[PDB]
Structure 1
């Protein structure tokens, strides 16, 4: 049930991620947050993020997730419209790989979790 088991190829991950990353770069809006973090650790984010999309609940007992994201709401004025932004980009990513909509619809559900979202706003 590992990521590799889903794609069945390592490189597939390099490109899959590279595609998203390249897109996240164009959006200088969300980049405002990646100002403190370096470009090195940044990529790692798009990796663990693009993973949780496929329901990679391997290990995510929150707790730290909140605090980690909390440091943001402290300095950066994070909001909801922000989550919908990065979330959309992902949708356009799967559209480039020529993937049916029905399949892309389920993906939205996974990330459409109310909890994960509530964690961002920290409440």
Structure 2
């Protein structure tokens, strides 16, 4: 079974993403990164992205992480602390939803992979 399946599939990811952005927009460390972001579009992209990242689809139909975050790194000071805030907010949301610790851990390994971090932070 994939991580996607174990978590509860579409409706679990849909709920997690919605809740995650609720948490992010209240997080003073990072909420301002989304000041000019269309959150309907962002929600749909993240649902599609995590579906892919958790093995629910072969591919992500959307931007690469490096190009996606480039303007944030170059113009708005996006750094490792913001990255860690995002990972922490995602995992907090899953804990709150009742996702078991062993699955929360598999998600942490995805969100924290160097191939993700280096591209997002354009390092």
Range into which the TM-score falls when normalised by the shorter chain: 0.7 to 0.9
The structure-2 alpha-carbon separation of the partners of 1:117 and 1:29, relative to structure 1 and needing over 3 Å to count, comes to: same
Query: Is the 1:20–1:90 contact (alpha carbons within 8 Å) kept by the matching residues of 2?
Result: yes
CA RMSD of aligned residues (A): 3.1
Q: TM-score, normalised by structure 2?
A: 0.74
Which position in structure 1 is the counterpart of 2:42? 42
Unaligned 5+ segments in structure 1 are none
Structure 2 unaligned regions, length at least 5 = none
User: Structure 1 residues 100, 73: closer, same or farther in 2, change over 3 A?
Assistant: same
Q: How many residues align?
A: 121
Could you tell me whether the CA contact under 8 Å between 2:5 and 2:56 is conserved in 1?
no
Q: 1:40 to 1:86 in 2, by over 3 A?
A: same
Provide the C-alpha distance between the structure 1 equivalents of 2:55 and 2:111, rounded to a whole number of angstroms: 8
Residue 110 (structure 1) aligns with? 110
Query: CA deviation digits over 1:1-22, x for unaligned, max 9?
Result: 6x57963564x45433322222
Q: Which runs of 4+ in 1 moved over 4 A?
A: 3-6
Please tell me whether Structure 1 or Structure 2 has the larger radius of gyration of its CA atoms: 1
